[PDB]
Write the structure tokens for this entry.
Amino acid sequence: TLKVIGVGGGGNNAVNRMIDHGMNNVEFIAINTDGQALNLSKAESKIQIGEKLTRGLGAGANPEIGKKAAEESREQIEDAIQGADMVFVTSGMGGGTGTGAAPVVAKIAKEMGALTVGVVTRPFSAEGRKRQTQAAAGVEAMKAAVDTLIVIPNDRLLDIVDKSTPMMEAFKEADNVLRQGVQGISDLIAVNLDFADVKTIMSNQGSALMGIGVSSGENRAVEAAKKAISSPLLETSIVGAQGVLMNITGGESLSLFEAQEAADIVQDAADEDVNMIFGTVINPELQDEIVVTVIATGF
Ligand SMILES: Nc1nc2c(ncn2[C@@H]2O[C@H](COP(=O)(O)OP(=O)(O)OP(=O)(O)O)[C@@H](O)[C@H]2O)c(=O)[nH]1
């Protein structure tokens, strides 16, 4: 049983779009300091923190306001966690709530036995410098609290998105990209994988990287993996890792051959003695095109 937690107004927009795409066998948790922003979440379970400290307003782009507001509500966080084997902390770094509360939600889930994954977006360079250093030094707090942290800088998204994209649809794509990271790993566990397998990939590895590839036509099984190995969302290239995870999602047409094909183009590009596993997701609503998702652990 897996549970997802959306810290901040950012992460909450992701959890909103995450069920808009329809996701199975993952229980949902939203967390916010703003009272009218958590009003809009579709999550099964909602929690507000810092009703004493913010009293309804957003935590006003201050990290410590979030950090101590979560300490105040330590109870309801412990409530929603226990009963879960794996915990996802999807939260947009930058704001007061996310940059302070999410590092706490994590370290609770870590010392509560469960597995801990941080799927966080860095902010744009177009949001000032002081907003960045917060988010970046908040990744620092995130880094040592979770098991693996999947940094997705939002500046890498400018290549995938248009030049014409406005402000409130530039984050619509960021929600979709945070979805691909969790859904990529979630759809594998609950022709499945062993859970104790992922324990070897994730446990106390550190900084992680994500790559996305989509291919349509004739030679889909290869053009996908190639575009995934050279995705802009990867800072470096995938060779550094001591462990790789691969998700191949395709429609009814997907052949057991195509999977082994794509898996070897990735295995070639990775280090020669790497920990690697992979799975096949049959998603009937997909027409002909498929999608490959790559995770790199331990640099
Ligand atoms: N995934 C995603 N990230 C967003 C979205 N909007 C903003 N962000 C990122 O998240 C950062 C902080 O925004 P919020 O999460 O809404 O702020 P907060 O965590 O609620 O903290 P406060 O400033 O106190 O409200 C920004 O710097 C953006 O980079 C969004 O709609 N989706």
Notes: The chain has two domains: 1-204, 205-299. Residues 8-10, 13-14, 58-61, 92, 94-98, 121, 123, 127, 131, 154, 171, 174-175, 178 surround guanosine-5'-triphosphate (CB under 6 Å). Strands lie at 2-7, 26-32, 45-48, 86-91, 115-121, 148-152, 206-215, 243-250, 275-282, 290-297.
